[PDB]
């Protein structure tokens, strides 16, 4: 996270760390949506241009952590993964369209004060909240500039108009993504950086006070560049794929 701040303890109880098994290396953010399903970005698992094709064997997730350094005894958990599911129409070649992946935990995790699932956006929350000018929140342990934090970092960022997202890049953007971040003339900064990929973009509903995950940190041109915006997988638009996978398996 760039230009964020330290999270309060338990501020993001749905946070998940995606590690490569060996050498043990922090790869990405992720999010807990139930006692055994974790949401992340497909490109955290499959990106050929970096010779990246992980399987369930290669990875672990750590849940409930707060300080990347400190080992939080009796607070943090570790889970191997049973299977991973990349969206079939994931398009890594052209534009990272449908940058979304599900990971099933080998054994379910126990909820606690520090481990709690986020909501998937329903149709009503999606229509009221996912609008330009409304701010969401991004969290992760990625780089602080384009420099690794101890404690989870958090930043709030507004959603940007779709025409403005399109004109910021040559990439062919789709309705399965949205972009967020401040504009150069709004005098505030902030963005997700590498390491933060696959982490959640959440918004708190004023209707019922729950937090919903509207986005997955997907791509951007560097980090926190003027006139550039973070791009986020549009979680609600891929909810039926999420639901078809979870019911199936």
């Amino acid at each position: 996270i760039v230009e964020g701040s330290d999270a309060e303890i338990g501020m993001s109880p749905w946070q998940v760390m995606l590690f490569r098994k060996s050498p043990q290396e922090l790869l990405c953010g992720a999010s807990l949506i139930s006692d055994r399903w974790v949401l992340t970005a497909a490109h955290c698992l499959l990106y050929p241009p970096w010779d990246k094709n992980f399987t369930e064997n290669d990875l672990l997730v750590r849940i409930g952590k707060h300080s990347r350094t400190r080992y939080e005894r009796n607070i943090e958990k570790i889970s191997m993964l049973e299977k991973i599911y990349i969206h079939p129409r994931y398009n890594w070649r052209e534009n990272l369209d449908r940058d979304i992946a599900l990971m099933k935990l080998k054994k379910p995790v126990a909820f606690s004060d520090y481990i709690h699932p986020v909501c998937l956006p329903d149709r009503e929350t999606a229509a009221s909240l996912l609008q330009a000018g409304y701010k969401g929140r991004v969290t992760g342990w990625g780089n602080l500039k384009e420099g690794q934090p101890s404690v989870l970092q958090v930043v709030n960022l507004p959603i940007v108009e779709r025409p403005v997202c399109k004109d910021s890049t040559r990439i062919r953007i789709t309705d399965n993504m949205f972009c967020a971040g401040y504009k150069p003339d709004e005098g505030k900064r902030g963005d997700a950086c590498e390491g933060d990929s696959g982490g959640p973009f959440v918004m708190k509903s004023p209707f019922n006070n729950r937090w919903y995950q509207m986005g997955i940190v997907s791509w951007g041109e560097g980090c926190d560049r003027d006139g550039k915006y973070g791009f986020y997988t549009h979680v609600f638009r891929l909810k039926k794929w999420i639901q078809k996978v979870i019911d199936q398996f």
Binding site: S5, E8, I9, G10, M11, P13, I33, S112, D113, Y114, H116, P117, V118, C119, L120, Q131, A132, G133, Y134, K135, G136, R137, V154, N156, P158, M203, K204, S205, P206, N209, R210, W211, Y212
Partner: peptide, 30 residues
């Protein structure tokens, strides 16, 4: 049916340090 409600904040009627900035963007942001 318990998603989105944080043990250490919503469940304790405690507000985190920056969530108000989000609520206010619903007023000012459009």
């Amino acid at each position: 049916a318990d998603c989105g409600l944080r043990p250490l904040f919503e469940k304790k009627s405690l507000e985190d340090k920056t969530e108000r900035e989000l609520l206010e963007s619903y007023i000012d942001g459009r």
